[PDB]
Amino acid sequence: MSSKETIPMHQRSQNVAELLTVLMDINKINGGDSTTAEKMKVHAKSFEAALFEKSSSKEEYQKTMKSKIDAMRSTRDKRKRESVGS
User: Where in the cell is it found?
Assistant: First the structure.
């Protein structure tokens, strides 16, 4: 479908921004720095660009983003077992 050929960057950036907030949560949970939060922005914008290489449906871009958010969400919880045993 031509949606995969036309999807707005403003829509991609709004979805990348939900991933950004979960990576910013790692910088809280591990107690990193403002420059390490700049590395979190770079990690999201590298992921975005590397998912765009494999974008072969809008529903595959959208579900792979959701499943990366699910992996990083689950990693917040993992880093909590490794930090405090909860």
Answer: Nucleus
The coordinates were experimentally obtained by: NMR
Q: What are phi and psi of 66, to 5 degrees?
A: -55, -45
> What is the dihedral sign for C-alpha 72, 76, 79, 81?
negative
Question: What's the CA gap between 55 and 37, in Å, rounded?
Answer: 27
d(CA 83, CA 85): 6
What are the sequence ranges of the domains in the chain? 1-86
C-beta of residue 75 within 8 angstroms of C-beta of residue 26: yes
> How long is the chain?
86
State the Cα–Cα distance between residues 43 and 50, nearest whole angstrom.
10
